[PDB]
């Protein structure tokens, strides 16, 4: 904890409200790419579970030209998440021949956008034929909205399978778990970043799981930001932690179906917080879960776990897994 990132993050938001007003302060999250440009007068927001691509501007002077350029930028940007500050209005020149959204959003024509020529056209279509308006209360906000292909999620999840597969055998963790979580945590968003700076596809925070993992493997110190914005490594690492919550921390839990529930919950709020729903004594806790049927452990973790986020998440990961279980 020697960051000082907090000071920038705090003035990013305020830079926003200075222009957008407190009510219109939208910002990057796990399931939402959001990038300001044009001195914070322009927003490119990808929503990875809706999954829409609203581009808005509030510049007074030439709204279209401002919008235009965001559309082309969002549609063509290559998925280099490491070269990308989702907290500056600085230009992350990430134009690639291999767009991150290629396969995930289409022309009005119905084709994939790959080069500036179609990107320009999809843009120009939308500015002449899909433009919209709302108000701050103060200024008009001009908006374009783009829906992504209906299976954008499993089209996005496809990038990370080779990674999930490798990490699943290395550590012993079911890919289904890895995907369920990865899905639930980021909707497969490589740009994913939390308010509590959990990072990347598996929403991993450097100074808890990232430390403990690095502490296995035999690595003094702590995972780099770039490191977690490598899908290959973030998936390595979230998985490594899943292994860990199961071998050590929640390994005193007898029943493996019960243990998984603990693991999942724990993956989101810590093993200490899981065990602490039964006893403040980590042994007594394990003893009590072994008193139970995996369904009552589920129904406990789902009803009595202190975090709202963590109760609503078990059903999310447990449910996503059922889908991923079969091949
Ligand atoms: C929405 O996305 C966010 O998700 C990630 C998961 O995706 C959330 O991050 C999880 O947050 C947990 C903190 O809430 C964190 O667990 C804490 O983990 C550490 C590390 O293992 C535990 O401390 C270790 O504890 C053992 C003792 O059991 C000691 O041996 C170790 O030495 C400790 N090691 C280190 C390095 O500290 C900590 O538990 C201990 C025991 C404790 N009682 O303090 C554990 N927390 C709790 C309550 O038990 C997870 O590590 C992390 N998961 C991942 C993958 O990173 C994130 O949560 C935030 C930060 C939150 N809950 O507010 C999610 N949410 C947001 C909003 O961003």
UniProtKB/Swiss-Prot annotation:
The keyword ATP-binding does not apply. It catalyses: Exolytic cleavage of the (1->4)-beta-glycosidic linkage between N-acetylmuramic acid (MurNAc) and N-acetylglucosamine (GlcNAc) residues in peptidoglycan, from either the reducing or the non-reducing ends of the peptidoglycan chains, with concomitant formation of a 1,6-anhydrobond in the MurNAc residue. PROSITE patterns: PROKAR_LIPOPROTEIN, TRANSGLYCOSYLASE. It is found in: Cell outer membrane. It is an enzyme of class 4 (lyase). GO terms for biological process: cell wall macromolecule catabolic process; cell wall organization; peptidoglycan metabolic process. GO terms for cellular component: cell outer membrane. Coiled coil: none annotated. It comes from the Bacteria. This is Membrane-bound lytic murein transglycosylase C. It comes from Escherichia coli (strain K12 / MC4100 / BW2952).
């Amino acid at each position: 904890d020697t960051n000082g990132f907090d000071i920038l993050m705090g003035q990013f938001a305020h830079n926003i409200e200075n222009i957008w007003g407190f009510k219109e302060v939208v910002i990057a999250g796990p399931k939402d790419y959001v990038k300001y440009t044009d001195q914070y007068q322009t927003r490119s927001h990808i929503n990875f579970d809706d999954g829409t691509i609203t581009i808005e501007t509030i510049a007074g002077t030439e709204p279209a030209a401002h919008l235009r350029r965001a559309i082309i930028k969002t549609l063509l940007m290559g998925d280099d998440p490491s070269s990308v500050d989702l907290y500056s209005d600085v230009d992350d020149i990430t134009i690639s021949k291999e767009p991150f959204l290629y396969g995930q959003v289409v022309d009005n024509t119905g084709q994939p956008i790959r080069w500036e020529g179609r990107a320009s056209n999809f843009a120009d279509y939308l500015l002449k034929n899909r433009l919209k308006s709302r108000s701050n209360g103060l200024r008009i906000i001009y908006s374009v909205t783009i829906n992504m292909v209906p299976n954008h999620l499993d089209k996005r999840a496809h990038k990370y399978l080779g990674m999930v597969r490798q990490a699943s055998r290395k550590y012993g963790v079911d890919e289904s778990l890895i995907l369920a979580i990865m899905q639930t945590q980021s909707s497969f968003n490589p740009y994913a970043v939390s308010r509590s700076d959990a990072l990347g596809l598996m929403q991993v925070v450097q100074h808890t799981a990232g430390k403990d993992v690095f502490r296995s493997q035999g690595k003094s110190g702590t995972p780099s930001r770039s490191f977690l914005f490598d899908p290959a490594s973030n998936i390595d690492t979230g998985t490594a932690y899943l292994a860990m919550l199961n071998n050590v921390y929640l390994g005193g839990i007898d029943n493996p179906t019960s243990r998984r529930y603990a693991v999942i919950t724990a993956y989101n709020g810590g093993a200490g917080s899981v065990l602490r729903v039964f006893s403040n004594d980590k042994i007594q806790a394990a003893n009590i879960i072994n008193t139970m049927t995996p369904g009552d452990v589920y129904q406990t973790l789902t009803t009595r776990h202190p975090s709202a986020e963590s109760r609503r998440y078990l059903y999310k990961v447990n449910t996503a897994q059922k889908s991923y279980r079969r091949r």
